[PDB]
Amino acid sequence: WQENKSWNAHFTEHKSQGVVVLWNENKQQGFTNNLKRANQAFLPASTFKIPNSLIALDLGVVKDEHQVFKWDGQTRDIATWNRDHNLITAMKYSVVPVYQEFARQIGEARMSKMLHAFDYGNEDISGNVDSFWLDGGIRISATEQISFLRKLYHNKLHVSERSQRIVKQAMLTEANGDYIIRAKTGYDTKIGWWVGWVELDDNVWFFAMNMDMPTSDGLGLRQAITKEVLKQEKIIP
């Protein structure tokens, strides 16, 4: 692990504070602007959709990325939520109600057992079974997110290979001739997250970032600051 404080200028430039963690898979080396915060644990919020999806697929709660999760007829503030969804759109729009239903069907016992099998964060599901990742006891750090993602990337998690391939497909965020990003956003009213990885032709760079997010004003910063770090390190052009 190497600390590079020069990344802090990207945060300063945006009147923000946070951590970016990068892992170079080929070199097995990590880099971050703040080693201490890199190892501090926070509520995952919607980044929890990654393990939740995996578990739901492995248990058959979700069949595949095409199955329709019918809208439950309750109108909610976020317009995109008020419609039918599949795994791809549910991830893309972070549709909380669909995942809450998943969590209820999974149940606390299977949920707790799976997170333990995954070595996921503090592995604590205390609170409501359908909301612990938003306001309950579970915590994970940026470095822990990287460890978890590395296992997912290599199909090493304790679910089927098929479930893992499907979730990586659903994580697809951006792709062009230069790179591919597979990732998940999250935010909880105190912290904003972006975790995932960048696929290059001959390497993979895992990333996990979080930042203080007093208002939702700055949500776009999660990707922007990360990309500035990626640009500075020449990972993307």
A 10 A CB-CB count for 167 gives 28
Q: Is 210 annotated as a binding residue?
A: no
Q: Is 216 a catalytic residue?
A: no
Report if residue 176 touches its own copies, rule: CB under 8 A: yes
Binding Na ion (rule: CB under 5 A), the pick from 104, 139, 150, 165 is: 150
A 10 A CB-CB count for 120 gives 24
Provide, rounded to whole angstroms, the least separation between the CB of residue 95 and its own copies: 12
Of 6-14, 132-140, 196-204, 225-233, the window that binds its own copies (rule: CB under 8 A) is: 196-204
Report if residue 174 touches its own copies, rule: CB under 8 A: yes
List b or e across 24-48, with b for residues whose CB sees 16 or more CB atoms inside 10 angstroms.
Answer: ebeeeebbbbbeebbeeebbbbbbb
Report if residue 10 touches Na ion, rule: CB under 5 A: yes
Helices 49-59 and 108-118 cross at an angle (nearest 10°) of 110
Question: Would you give the end-to-end CA distance of the chain in angstroms?
Answer: 24
Of 4-12, 89-97, 107-115, 188-196, the window that binds Na ion (rule: CB under 5 A) is: 4-12
Which among 133, 121, 55, 46 has a CA at the least distance from the CA of 91?
46
Report if residue 224 touches Na ion, rule: CB under 5 A: yes
Tell me the per-residue interface mask from 148 to 167 with its own copies, x by CB under 8 A, - otherwise: -------------xx--xx-
184 binds, among Na ion, its own copies, none (CB under 5 to 8 A by kind): none
Report if residue 188 touches its own copies, rule: CB under 8 A: no
Catalytic residue among 16, 46, 53, 94: 46
| CA dist list (Å): 107 to 61, 133, 180 | 11, 14, 34
Provide, rounded to whole angstroms, the least separation between the CB of residue 50 and Na ion: 17
In sequence order, the 6+-apart residues with CB closer than 8 A to the CB of 20 are 7, 32, 33, 207, 208, 209, 225, 226, 229
The C-alpha atoms of residue 43 and residue 132 are separated, in whole angstroms, by 9
Contact 164, 182 (CB under 8 A): no
Binding Na ion (rule: CB under 5 A), the pick from 12, 13, 17, 117 is: 13
Q: Is 14 annotated as a binding residue?
A: yes
- The separation between CA 1 and the C-alpha centre of its own chain, rounded to angstroms, equals 22
Positions touching Na ion (CB under 5 A) are 10, 13, 150, 224
Positions touching its own copies (CB under 8 A) are 88-89, 92, 161-162, 165-166, 169, 172-177, 180, 199, 201-202
Bind-site residues for Mg(2+): 82
List residues with catalytic annotation: 46
Bind-site residues for Zn(2+): 13-14, 158, 228
